[PDB]
Design a protein around this nucleic acid. Structure first.
Ligand SMILES: [Mg+2]
Ligand SMILES: [Mg+2]
Ligand SMILES: [Mg+2]
Ligand SMILES: [Mg+2]
Ligand SMILES: [Mg+2]
Ligand SMILES: [Mg+2]
Ligand SMILES: [Mg+2]
Ligand SMILES: [Mg+2]
Ligand SMILES: [Mg+2]
Ligand SMILES: [Mg+2]
Lengths: 103, 110, 103, 108
DNA sequence: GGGAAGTGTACGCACCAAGCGTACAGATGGC
DNA sequence: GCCATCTGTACGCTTGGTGCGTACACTTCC
């Protein structure tokens, strides 16, 4: 379409100055930076119990060794960072689990 | 970077959906929060930045441009416009000088 | 009760018998078995290059140490199973990346 | 490597009780463990599973009755319902189902 | 009310990943 | 048109994960 760069930049910059002064309302989206994710063994167990799945089935659906998941839930080892990320992804968005199995 | 805010211009709000999906837009905001200097400075404009998106490589052929200004002391991104790469003329020297003067007067005010 | 169990169970088992005989068509969904996920260093680099992201930003959005991601792309270490799973998840559904940062 | 066949009744009602995503995860769960549902006593091997429970959620809940056909890895999904909206199967009904199941197993 | 898997507990052990520190080598971006 | 900045290479090293291999008990279902 017929679209002028300088004209739009001028209109947008006068909107921006007026907004910074507080004389104008514009659509605003915030974003928080990424956080330091961690998880306890009890939290892992509770995640899996929310699905009502045995350890084997849950590990299988998460592409994870069931013996390593055993190590995590008994608290023998601290899960690697990606495991914590994956687990909490599933916890907050459980539909992800089916898609994770689909890979 | 405790937190960053994106402010859409009316023009940006009006056109963003023609060029960026919501998911693409969400990933774009995350990218910019991580690197506020992601876009290259437009020479002679007092710090306006231009960023190419929707390109994995050979991004000139691929579609869209975003122009923005980052207000450092407020961690605030003003998203000024969005367009296709060959849809809009370029800025001649007088236009750039005028933008530079506007940005300098604004930065001078506060 | 607006619905009596035996009537539905009987109609369903006679449908099942007829489908096993091959005289009837019913809506059918398959699901594939779970796989052994693996990934090469080149595949990791190519995944990240699909996003037009630097190593640092990609690691940050994936809640991952950039030095570890460096280890993977240089081929110094083999990524852990959950890392491969996460990477392939992002490769297959790139919108996941935003949600992964969102946690 | 496993196949699910919906009855017409299941097809008509599944969407009222199960979302599509819940159904996909349900299929994955059952393929991993075909014995997830408890055998209904005296019926020749029909299985009943509650799947609207986040663990021991007995009061709330949807119910599925299914049958696992060893050959072909094939699950027949027979019905879907709300937890307390359905009568039980009496002894004559169970005996009749047991005879039907035995005739199928004999045929195969 | 028996039997049998079906789940969990915990410990030991070889390999090697994880996450740096550290020294270099190019490639771009800001005037 | 000569600068930090940005973005990658590679190796060594300390700490701990990992994925069993094994022995051993309760329990839910047949
Ligand atoms: Mg437990
Ligand atoms: Mg608990
Ligand atoms: Mg929970
Ligand atoms: Mg929750
Ligand atoms: Mg909009
Ligand atoms: Mg490549
Ligand atoms: Mg360290
Ligand atoms: Mg360091
Ligand atoms: Mg260069
Ligand atoms: Mg380690």
């Amino acid at each position: 379409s017929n679209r002028d760069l300088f004209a739009e930049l001028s209109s947008a910059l006068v909107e921006a100055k007026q907004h910074s002064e507080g004389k104008l309302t514009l659509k605003t989206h915030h974003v928080n930076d990424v956080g330091e994710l961690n998880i306890s063994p009890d939290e892992i167990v509770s995640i899996r119990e929310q699905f009502n799945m045995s350890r084997g089935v849950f590990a299988r659906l998460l592409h994870t060794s069931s013996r390593t998941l055993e190590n995590w839930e008994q608290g023998r080892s601290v899960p690697n960072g990606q495991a914590v990320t994956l687990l909490k992804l599933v916890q907050r968005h459980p539909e992800t689990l089916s898609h994770i199995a689909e890979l | 970077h405790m937190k960053s805010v994106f402010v859409e211009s009316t023009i940006f709000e009006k056109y963003r959906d023609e060029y960026l999906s919501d998911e693409e837009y969400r990933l774009f905001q995350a990218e910019l929060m991580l690197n506020p200097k992601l876009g290259d400075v437009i020479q002679g404009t007092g710090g306006l930045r231009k960023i190419r998106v929707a390109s994995k490589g050979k991004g000139k052929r691929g579609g869209s441009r975003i122009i923005y200004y980052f207000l450092d002391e407020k961690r605030r991104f003003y998203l000024l416009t969005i367009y296709g790469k060959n849809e809009m003329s370029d800025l001649n020297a007088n236009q750039r000088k005028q933008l530079m003067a506007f940005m300098e007067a604004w930065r001078n005010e506060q």
